Amino acid sequence: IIGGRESRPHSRPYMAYLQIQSPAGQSRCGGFLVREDFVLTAAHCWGSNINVTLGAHNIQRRENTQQHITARRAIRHPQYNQRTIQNDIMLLQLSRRVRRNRNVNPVALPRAQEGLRPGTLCTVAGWGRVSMRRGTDTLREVQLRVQRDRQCLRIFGSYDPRRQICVGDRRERKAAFKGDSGGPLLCNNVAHGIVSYGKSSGVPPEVFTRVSSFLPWIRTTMR
């Protein structure tokens, strides 16, 4: 997160920290708990083995509030497009149900085809980098505004407003950044978006997957 603030510890108890390992390399991503047994995240965060940490604030410390669970199944959307980063949504079926408590509990999803007006204030949270030079051990968050689609459509030629959300003001140094992928766009306490992509510079606007456009696939996959 660029231009944000350290989270109040455990104030966002749906947050999931993802450590992804494959023979050729690793990745770190965010995600969010949507049922006691499923985490939603970005499909470009997929890999051979996925460790999920719930209940964390400092991911560099083995805090006793943390629950470590492996992804039994990592289900990328079947039409995920790696070239353009479209349909960028993945469900993780966890190996065990989480123990729900104050530090671990799911977040609500939007209603079908729910929309978001430009100007809506949302919060995004994650453990990603805060600049080119520095990272964070603890959870950070920033408030961002939903934009009119035209702000993204010219910069990101493959942007599709039917399946994605355009977020962030171009003149601000406030954004999600590297390592924040898969974390939620929270508007009015509902997860409307998933952090997906933007510019190498981290300058806004940036693109989020529009959760409401995938609710049937979500529901079908979880049952």
Partner: protein, 103 residues
């Protein structure tokens, strides 16, 4: 070299960069050629962003930039088949930033 170096890398294609934080494994305390590393970069371009060899061929530009531990940078043109005949240490690579523009 059983343990591996984890070198941060970024991929931008057509002005789009995914916001994961990713690392490429290289054998620790190993020597490598620009052919080896270039081929690893090509494999990564394909498996992470679906970028094919033909796409690198027809791209306006296709490069990757190695930031070495000394602070020096080398820019490698992926469209080229010329390789310097030297070897370099895997522990000397601090960062790799890959950028493809089909403009």
């Amino acid at each position: 070299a059983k343990e591996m170096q984890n070198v941060p890398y970024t991929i931008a294609v057509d002005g789009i960069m995914a916001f994961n934080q990713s690392y490429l494994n290289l054998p620790k305390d190993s020597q490598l050629s620009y052919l080896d590393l270039g081929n690893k970069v090509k494999a990564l371009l394909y498996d992470e962003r679906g970028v094919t060899p033909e796409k690198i061929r027809n791209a306006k530009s296709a490069v990757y930039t190695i930031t070495w531990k000394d602070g020096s940078k080398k820019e490698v043109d992926l469209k080229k088949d010329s390789y310097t005949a030297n070897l370099f240490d895997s522990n000397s690579i601090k960062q790799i930033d890959i950028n493809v523009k089909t403009k």
